[PDB]
Write a protein that binds this ligand. Structure first.
Ligand SMILES: O=S1(=O)CC(c2ccc(O)cc2)=C(c2ccc(O)cc2)C1
Ligand SMILES: O=S1(=O)CC(c2ccc(O)cc2)=C(c2ccc(O)cc2)C1
Lengths: 242, 10, 234, 10
């Protein structure tokens, strides 16, 4: 298809070109935050980011080739992982802080305004500290983010033709793997340093999955508690994870 | 399904 | 450190030598299963498996080098992942079935005997078919399991753990090179294996909340060791 | 986390 014939530098350029924008929040520094107000800004922010992510997913090489129900499944399972790694990525050059928006840069002390948030806050910070220590590159970021979209839901899909579409997902994933190796070779990394860094990057996705699962329970805790109003799309993505 | 609608936007 | 010194073949043999044994289920409730009897068999089995896992971890190269608090943190974070990847591994040549014990082989219909269990059952069977589809080797399996132990709790703290993690990467690549796979085939299979760990973590989180439900539902009393491991995820 | 302490020290 389109993604299979695509080269490494063309894979990178397609992903780099499909990046969603950085959005601003309605945050007013004149007033101090509360649990309801802070959680209202983050929920409003994620809801708007969700819209851009869905159209970003449509531009990931291979995602169009899938059926609409398979596209829904991957996004239903990966949406918070993708929001989180994007948050971690743009927070990379702000140690000890999470850049939710250019006008919203929070400490872990401010994250205490929301119950249970500080645990997920520290996990997001440690991941961003890990990206900084690894000096993660933007070309590697877009590859990892596309891997999350294609991988996080592929093990919850029994036709042989079902197999054919699933084997297509593994075919695109193998291509993105080749693209990551292609990038590391250009940076002057030895073959040993290439496999090692590839392992380090993919092992972070395990922790990102963990953050998303812990984050999924935190959002479901506030849907029933009704502490902050959740948008219609977010409540729909939340019921996918039950 | 809002996700299904947003995905099926032409 | 002592784990960075030995070679890849030496690393594989040290991991294969430390493999815990396969334990048997209790033959006492060997009748057809209710929700309480099945949960009692798996709780008892998992509790006894935990004891062997803790001693298996001490034989993981580089694990003893860590402090006791660091050993406690890694085992607290990974114990259900490690139990699950072991269950998936020994269920490989039993497609459509999960071999909890040699005398306790179950399919997804029997998993429905417990509330909320069939969902975790299907994710476990899906992991087993993936290992079978990939033809996962025992030397690869012991590498993934050690990676889970050292990696799952490392970002909740360090530099020595990553060096041992890099060593198991070198060991994984060494194994695939012996199998004749090309360079492109080596870093694609490395990627495919490590991406499964993301799904095994997902199963652990879903399993963790499921074991918390039946703790509150109190379908079966949990051992003090299992309670302490479950409380670490709260 | 005390039982895990004992088993790790035998
Ligand atoms: O886990 S969080 O605290 C972080 C986070 C988030 C992550 C990225 C965003 O762009 C916006 C929000 C969260 C979020 C919050 C509400 C929501 O509906 C979706 C994600 C929660
Ligand atoms: O998530 S489970 O259903 C799977 C599982 C398990 C997994 C592997 C084992 O060797 C033993 C038990 C479970 C287990 C069950 C009871 C328990 O007390 C601890 C783990 C639960």
């Amino acid at each position: 298809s389109l993604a299979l014939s695509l080269t490494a530098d063309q894979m990178v350029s397609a992903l780099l070109d499909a990046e969603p924008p950085i959005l601003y929040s309605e945050y007013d520094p004149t007033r101090p935050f509360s649990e309801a107000s802070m959680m209202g800004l983050l929920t409003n922010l994620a809801d708007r980011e969700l819209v851009h992510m869905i159209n970003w997913a449509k531009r990931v090489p291979g995602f169009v080739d899938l059926t609409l129900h398979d596209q829904v499944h991957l996004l239903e399972c990966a949406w918070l992982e993708i929001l989180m790694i994007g948050l971690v990525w743009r927070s990379m050059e702000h140690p000890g802080k999470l850049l939710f928006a250019p006008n919203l840069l929070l400490d872990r002390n401010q994250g205490k305004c929301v119950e249970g948030m500080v645990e997920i806050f520290d996990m997001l910070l440690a991941t961003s500290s890990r990206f900084r220590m690894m000096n993660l590159q933007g070309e590697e970021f877009v590859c990892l983010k596309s891997i999350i979209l294609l991988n996080s839901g592929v093990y919850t899909f029994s036709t042989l033709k079902s197999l054919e579409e699933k084997d297509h997902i593994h075919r695109v994933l193998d291509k993105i793997t080749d693209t990551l190796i292609h990038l590391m070779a250009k940076a002057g990394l030895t073959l040993q340093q290439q496999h090692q860094r590839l392992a380090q990057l993919l092992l972070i996705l395990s922790h990102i999955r963990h953050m998303s699962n812990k984050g999924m329970e935190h959002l479901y805790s506030m849907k029933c508690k009704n502490v902050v109003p959740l948008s219609d799309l977010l409540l729909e993505m939340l019921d996918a994870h039950r | 399904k809002i996700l299904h609608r947003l995905l099926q936007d032409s």
